[PDB]
Amino acid sequence: GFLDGKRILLTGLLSNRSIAYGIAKACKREGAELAFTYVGDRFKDRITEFAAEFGSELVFPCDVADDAQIDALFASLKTHWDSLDGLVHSIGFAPREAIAGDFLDGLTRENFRIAHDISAYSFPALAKAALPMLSDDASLLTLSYLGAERAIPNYNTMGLAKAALEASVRYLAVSLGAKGVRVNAISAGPIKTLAASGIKSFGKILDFVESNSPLKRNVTIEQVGNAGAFLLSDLASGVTAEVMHVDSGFNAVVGGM
Amino acid sequence: GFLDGKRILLTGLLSNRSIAYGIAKACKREGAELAFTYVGDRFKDRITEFAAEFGSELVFPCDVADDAQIDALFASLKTHWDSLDGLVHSIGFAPREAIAGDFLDGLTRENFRIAHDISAYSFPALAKAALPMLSDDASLLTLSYLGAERAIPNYNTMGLAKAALEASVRYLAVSLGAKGVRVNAISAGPIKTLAASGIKSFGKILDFVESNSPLKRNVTIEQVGNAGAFLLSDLASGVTAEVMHVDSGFNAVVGGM
Amino acid sequence: GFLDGKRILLTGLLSNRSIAYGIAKACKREGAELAFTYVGDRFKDRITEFAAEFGSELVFPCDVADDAQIDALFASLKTHWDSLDGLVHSIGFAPREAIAGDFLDGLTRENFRIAHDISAYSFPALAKAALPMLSDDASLLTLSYLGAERAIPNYNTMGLAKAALEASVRYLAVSLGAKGVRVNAISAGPIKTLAASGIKSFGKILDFVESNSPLKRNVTIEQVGNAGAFLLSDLASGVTAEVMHVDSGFNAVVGGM
Amino acid sequence: GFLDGKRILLTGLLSNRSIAYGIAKACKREGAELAFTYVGDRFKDRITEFAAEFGSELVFPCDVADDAQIDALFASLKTHWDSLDGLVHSIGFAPREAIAGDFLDGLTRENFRIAHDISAYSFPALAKAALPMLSDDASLLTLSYLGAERAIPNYNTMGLAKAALEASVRYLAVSLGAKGVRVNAISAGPIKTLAASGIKSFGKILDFVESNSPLKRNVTIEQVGNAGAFLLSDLASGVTAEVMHVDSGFNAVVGGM
Numbered sequence A, B, C, D: 001g002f003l004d005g006k007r008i009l010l011t012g013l014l015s016n017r018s019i020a021y022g023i024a025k026a027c028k029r030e031g032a033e034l035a036f037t038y039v040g041d042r043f044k045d046r047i048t049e050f051a052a053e054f055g056s057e058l059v060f061p062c063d064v065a066d067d068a069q070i071d072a073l074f075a076s077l078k079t080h081w082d083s084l085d086g087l088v089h090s091i092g093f094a095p096r097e098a099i100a101g102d103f104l105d106g107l108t109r110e111n112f113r114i115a116h117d118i119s120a121y122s123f124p125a126l127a128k129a130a131l132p133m134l135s136d137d138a139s140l141l142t143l144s145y146l147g148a149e150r151a152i153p154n155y156n157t158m159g160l161a162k163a164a165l166e167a168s169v170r171y172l173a174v175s176l177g178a179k180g181v182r183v184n185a186i187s188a189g190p191i192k193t194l195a196a197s198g199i200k201s202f203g204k205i206l207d208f209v210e211s212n213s214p215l216k217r218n219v220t221i222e223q224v225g226n227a228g229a230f231l232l233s234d235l236a237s238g239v240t241a242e243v244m245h246v247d248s249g250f251n252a253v254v255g256g257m
Ligand SMILES: NC(=O)c1ccc[n+]([C@@H]2O[C@H](COP(=O)([O-])OP(=O)(O)OC[C@H]3O[C@@H](n4cnc5c(N)ncnc54)[C@H](O)[C@@H]3O)[C@@H](O)[C@H]2O)c1
Pocket: A011, A012, A013, A014, A015, A017, A018, A019, A020, A038, A039, A062, A063, A064, A065, A089, A090, A091, A092, A093, A118, A143, A144, A145, A146, A187, A188, A189, A190, A191, A192, A193, A194, A195, A196
């Protein structure tokens, strides 16, 4: 495949419906060797199962809230891999209040801090900790959503955080690009993942993009996965600082009228 | 003037070159009554002078790092004003490291947190604390910069924070808009303010927009001020969730070639 | 007013609901002297009435399909006015087929040509013919719509034409900016004008932005007019190459979900 | 490869440095069968050579200025191919005057008409003529440039035309998407093609993106080609109405300062 020999670390694989799952499958299919992170010892066995699914026994703890775990993640990976060619950042969190109902009602200094810490800061944080072992053609990929660009109901503080995340893509691209490293995001359409249970009225968004997107269909983790594999590969050698929509074209319309 | 009888609170007036100074002058010129905030008792007298300059004796402490000062700000203002028609958010900060040289070198969890806390969170925080006394036609205005949209050298972590700030404009507009309140930003071009001493190679950016902007000239606080007064006024009744460039058109070109 | 002594030529005033009507009223209110164009002798008397409404007896024929009328327009104006400070381009047309139903069904080389000729070319064409008599602080303004940025049902070929029009704003700004002349567009929300009778399901768009815009209300020609007056004035001295949304913030949301 | 069995028609292959050449190579490499168009009998033999290079004897005349040639193109192709899976639109033209020096100096009704006719109209025109034989998973791809989004020196009227072209991508995506067909553009960085000899100071743009792009290098037709192959493939099943930058990230920075 077009990722033959590429070694890629994936965060955020929580279930078989996770976006990271779809990316993992496409990457493995195209020849990559994979490693995975998880959060909390309670989940080690589940991720080891998932990892086995993709021919991997490389799983490491990483709570991105903790500097020590971020550094220890790459120290551990480094015992197995001399170089890292790909990093998939598929991680996000905000307190339920901060993504329910009215934007201001859920706004507190702490809710803001946590959302931005986990959902935005963590991406350039992992990039920085990974840097010493990044191959010169490495590719860093994060996941965003249209709520970064336009106000979407309930998304609220996550929208602010995703806006900072997309900006981080641009600044990381400049910082790491001289070396040859690329940094991109996929702005994915809604997909029924575990995280989607967080978003109130996820169902309504889903119906709405099915009915209004140019392709008149929702995207799948297979589609987001294949797009991700492309960006992580040398096929996308000329692409950096890009936020690529993989959402059936929904971002490009005004729907519902 | 077109702000006759409007009552407007301005943050961020640090000197006579501050963007807030220019906005204040244009607002006063157009008939507004003004109030001002300041940071630290060491600065109370300077701001009282500035305020006197605009026919005001209404100055209040507000360090946006402190929830208690934010709430006390509007409690105090409320003893003088029954309603608030305008709020100017002209406040920003990042640790010098986070805006010098390479993006990653200056990246730390704490530098990130502080930049976003002060430069982004503070805007919807003030909006929320002001809400009870906002008139139905009130207008909230913040200041951003092109580094939010595109990577600019040295701007670094401030770029991430300004990206979150512009997103906050959109979500605030939805939250406060039913009531009739508008929320906008001006993305201003470079202006030799005290804050600009922070940015390394501010001089180079300045020369570059003078030479490459369509108007072949840098903007002034008078120009940004007049634009701000417009947005704060009923003239801009149909305008919300907008990031308006007041930068001699520089954002719209690719210059230097 | 803030347009005291400015002399401004307005195209596209077809009725008292025209966007140009609202702009004219705001400009006159702020002190401008106005002149108007019309299309076809059949309409001379109606426009003279409208013009009288704003204290003007300056009306001139200009079908923008005809080079000769464009040049004769400014030759005639020049007999009355030594200089021109403002130009309002509020003109658009596509064959009904090209804006009904499916984009491709209405697509023909000729429909395309006409839409772009009238709706896009005409703006920089008038700018070029006006140039010799433009004051150094003159301001050129055109009207666009969100269909330029995102696909909207039925808008079709007009969307392509408005995209070219907004690009023309940027290139005109660079061409005319050295001299000091500014060039901008207002992307207006839907307004029940005569032109709106063209757009099938204008009613549905109208309801939809009322229900989904942050301000939960449609814009008025008074609002678009005041925004236009601002851009045409020295208040907007720092603003060029800008497409300003005056649409109750609708562009900034994803609505209907 | 990931285009196994896909049948793809490419326009605009003029030389071995053409962007279409690079796309053709990547498509053939990934398993596609190709067909080609050319302009003028004088060029039939050159394109037959090029086509032989990619294992093809399918070459057809198509001057996009001529409706009859557009329809005859697909009638002819249809004698060889039952279905069409991919279309590459890599065609552009403006009179030299319209892309030299000042935007207005080169502006004439005819120069405008020709640029938009050839560079924009031709894309949805080919899509419409191809429609009856398009497979349900077909993918249409056109080539654009950053001058569509921001004013670039000399690009002038081509910038207006490319703006209309990118809009056409969005409207075509909605029109053809119900069927399942995708429509996208690649906004490519500068590449020393025959067409680039048109652009005055192409050399300066080239140096400038090498020095300022995040990757600090210019893109190649190999890079644009691989990106194109991806978009034309089922790998990009979730991607439509997208303008993908393949320009070393240059669009995402403000350079030169
Ligand atoms: N699901 C969607 O519709 C969607 C759409 C667009 C964009 N995005 C984004 O895709 C990414 C992946 O989410 P998903 O949809 O696959 O849901 P998911 O629940 O399957 O994955 C989310 C991941 O976030 C991780 N996470 C949360 N806090 C963490 C922490 N402190 N440290 C490390 N990891 C942490 C979880 O472990 C989980 O694996 C997210 O960034 C999300 O915002 C998702």
